[PDB]
Amino acid sequence: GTITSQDDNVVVGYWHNWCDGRGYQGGNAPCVELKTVNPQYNVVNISFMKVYDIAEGRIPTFKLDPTIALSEAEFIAQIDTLNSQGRSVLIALGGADAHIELTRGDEDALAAEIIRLTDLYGFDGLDIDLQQAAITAKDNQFVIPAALKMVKEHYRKTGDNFMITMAPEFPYLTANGAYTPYLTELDGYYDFINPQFYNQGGDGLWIEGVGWIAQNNDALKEEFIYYIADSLINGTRNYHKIPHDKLVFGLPSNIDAAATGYIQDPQDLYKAFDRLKAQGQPLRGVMTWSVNWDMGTDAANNSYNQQFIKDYGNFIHNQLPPVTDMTPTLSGIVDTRVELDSHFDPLIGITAKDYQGNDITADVTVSGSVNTNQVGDYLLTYSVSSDDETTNQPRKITVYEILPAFTGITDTTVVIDSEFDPMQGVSASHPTQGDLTANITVTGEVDTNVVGVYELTYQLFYGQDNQQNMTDKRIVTVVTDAVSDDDWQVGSTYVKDDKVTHNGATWTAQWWTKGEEPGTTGEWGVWR
Ligand SMILES: CC(=O)N[C@@H]1[C@@H](O)[C@H](O[C@@H]2O[C@H](CO)[C@@H](O[C@@H]3O[C@H](CO)[C@@H](O[C@@H]4O[C@H](CO)[C@@H](O[C@@H]5O[C@H](CO)[C@@H](O)[C@H](O)[C@H]5NC(C)=O)[C@H](O)[C@H]4NC(C)=O)[C@H](O)[C@H]3NC(C)=O)[C@H](O)[C@H]2NC(C)=O)[C@@H](CO)O[C@@H]1O
Ligand code: NA
Fold this sequence. Notes:
GO cellular component, one term: extracellular region
CATH superfamily of the largest domain: Glycosidases
Largest sheet: 8 strands, parallel
Binding site for Ca(2+): 214, 217
Number of strands: 29
Protein name: chitinase
CATH architecture of the largest domain: Alpha-Beta Barrel
GO molecular function: carbohydrate binding; chitin binding; endochitinase activity
Bound molecules: a molecule of 5 linked components (NDG-NAG-NAG-NAG-NAG), sodium ion
InterPro entries: CBM5/12, CBM_sf_5/12, Chitinase_II/V-like_cat, Cry22Aa_Ig-like, GH, Glyco_hydro18_cat, Glyco_hydro_18_chit_AS, Glycosyl_Hydrlase18_Chitinase
Radius of gyration: 39 Å
Number of helices: 8
Distance between the termini: 120 Å
Strand content: 25-35%
Strand order of the largest sheet: 8-7-6-5-4-1-12-11
């Protein structure tokens, strides 16, 4: 077949490239032939493309499991059958426990291998299902998008829409989260995203005014679906925006398919989707891990017997076609701190794209102005318009000033008649004004001829016209080098004629003493 893409709603189902997988509740997922997958799965994702052995190098590939007892030619024939029915068959990249680790420069080879596989098997696109370390490993976040742009562009040349989808686990979809480079680099290139709303336990989101709604909360499942979808399709509540026409809700087929996330009561999904439709934002479909689980058995060897497609196929297909959200995007805008009098350029680092991923950076406009010569906050708003839609985003610029620092102003003791230079070892600096030593004045003097304690007040003047100032005080004590009688000690014993220094005076013992303080023994006592 040819490249077969989906224009309307989708029910996506992963297909296991292996047999008899064990379920989270002890069930079993048989391998199944593609031609047996229920027709209402209009996108079927071959799982998985990955590195099958590092002796083949870093570029991942796909190798059909022969125990499924499809020859290569037969597998190709069943893909062609699905394509003849207008269904798409994508190759899923990654999966659980698949490590992929690419280096900048691997993008040409990855693209070449994607195309090779696509042309050989009849695949219609590729699903990004990077998990754990593979999301962020080495240069993956650059290489994988770059490769896929090439692949898209290669098939566009012949008028074919090579589909690109992704299956991020929903916790990675916060605004600056690990999947964000894939989503932003491929804006305009991807057909839809089918996040996983399973296996995340008690993770979820905080709804200001209703509380924490967890993915494992079966009492609040309607609210979970509604609010996490509402946040995603509007870029609110700290989630990255995925337009509603491009959001497909991923679910486990049953309790064996994933540890948590199974919808016990399909009504909760019907109602959440209906609510989303009611505010003008119908979703694009559902996704499931997996067709094999939908055709599998539980631990008691009872058949699941297609309960997932029974619950969701007709509901999702019997909907109007999607309506494209053509809002443009802005990238690069972050509140920024700028030091007083530095240069600031409000356009550097900021870019914009239309909904098809075309660069429209030159079309951005900015209102507001920053005055880097005055500390304070300044608010800018960036705007861009395309396709009769407009996106805006604020940016706070804070102008701040840093105090200079003195060095060398430490209390010190010097000997009588020594030379003392109050500026010796003293400096000031500032990060932007540089050496400010010449801006320091000294109030007070030290007289090194006269024993005593001398205070010096250092002032630094800085800033515009030197009208800012800071002060620091220093004590310089001048001590004699004159040797004197040893200080009186309260525990020492003295005898007649012994002399001691105490309380600034020299005293002479008149007889035996221990523990009597000089100066306190009166007109006629032991110390005189
Ligand atoms: C206490 C609490 O609430 N804790 C929370 C955490 O649980 C949670 O973090 C998640 O933690 C779970 C493990 O507890 C971790 O689980 C993986 O989930 C991924 C994503 O769904 C699973 O991968 C997909 O799901 C199916 C299985 O449901 C995968 O199917 C398997 O595929 C392999 C081949 O690749 C086969 O060998 C297997 O047989 C097959 N399994 C089955 C049953 O068929 C499929 O490959 C994946 N892709 C898709 C499209 O479905 C992965 O299997 C789960 N691993 C395990 C060991 O169970 C999940 O990834 C953690 N999430 C994160 C973000 O790290 C956090 C989340 O914030 O919150 C709490 O802390
Ligand atoms: Na095809």
